[PDB]
Each structure stands twice: as structure tokens, then as C-alpha cells.
């Protein structure tokens, strides 16, 4: 069956690749939970 995870990520840090310090782009929850929101580099809408 499978389901893709789509989250509503607002940024804070510049981010090496995709960031603006103000994107509204979407990613999987594995980015927010494991990488960013521990470090405090982003937030949820």
C-alpha cells in the first residue's frame, strides 16, 4: 500500500543546499525529526 510523508517545513539556518532562511518547501519527517529540529535549524507550520 505505502504512503509518502509530506511535512510543512519553514526554515531558519541558510542550509547547505535548498534553503533561503525562509522557504515553504516540503520534505519527509526524517529531515525534521533526525537532522534539523534537534539542531534547531527549522520549525513546523
Amino acid at each position: 500500500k505505502k504512503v509518502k510523508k509530506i511535512r510543512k517545513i519553514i526554515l531558519k539556518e541558510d542550509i547547505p543546499d535548498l534553503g533561503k532562511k525562509g522557504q515553504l518547501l516540503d520534505v519527509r519527517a526524517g529531515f525534521l525529526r533526525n537532522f534539523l529540529l534537534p539542531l534547531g535549524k527549522a520549525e513546523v507550520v
Binding site: 519527517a29 525529526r33 529540529l37 534537534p38
Partner: protein, 75 residues
Amino acid sequence: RRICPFTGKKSNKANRVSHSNHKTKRLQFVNLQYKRVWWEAGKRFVKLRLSTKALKTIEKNGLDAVAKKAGIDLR
């Protein structure tokens, strides 16, 4: 103990059946895990044993919202 401290979920009884109905009993366990969580205020690791649905609830309602329903906190 096969108990998620947040959801209160236990393992479940099951007479798991053959094609011929010659039953047994076994436990359908909970999908627990040892995993780090991320506290809002503290901003630390929290090394907990949770279900998979516990993760979903935490990502829904921020840890402290969930963690009030299991009295113990600050590790």
C-alpha cells in the same frame, strides 16, 4: 515489559490459526523501540522506549502535551 508508557498499549492474545483450525496461542507484541526523542524546552536527547504510534502522537502534539498523561518526566 512490553508496554508503551504513553499509549498504554500491551501485547494482544491470538489463537493464530492453521488452514485446518488447529489453534495455538501467541502474543501479537507492540512495535516498541529504544529511541531518542527531542524535548522542546531542554532541547536534549531523551532516551525512551516508545511505540510507533507514540512517535505519531509526539509529532502530532509536542512531547509535553503527551508526557503529562504519563506523570513521570525529567527522566
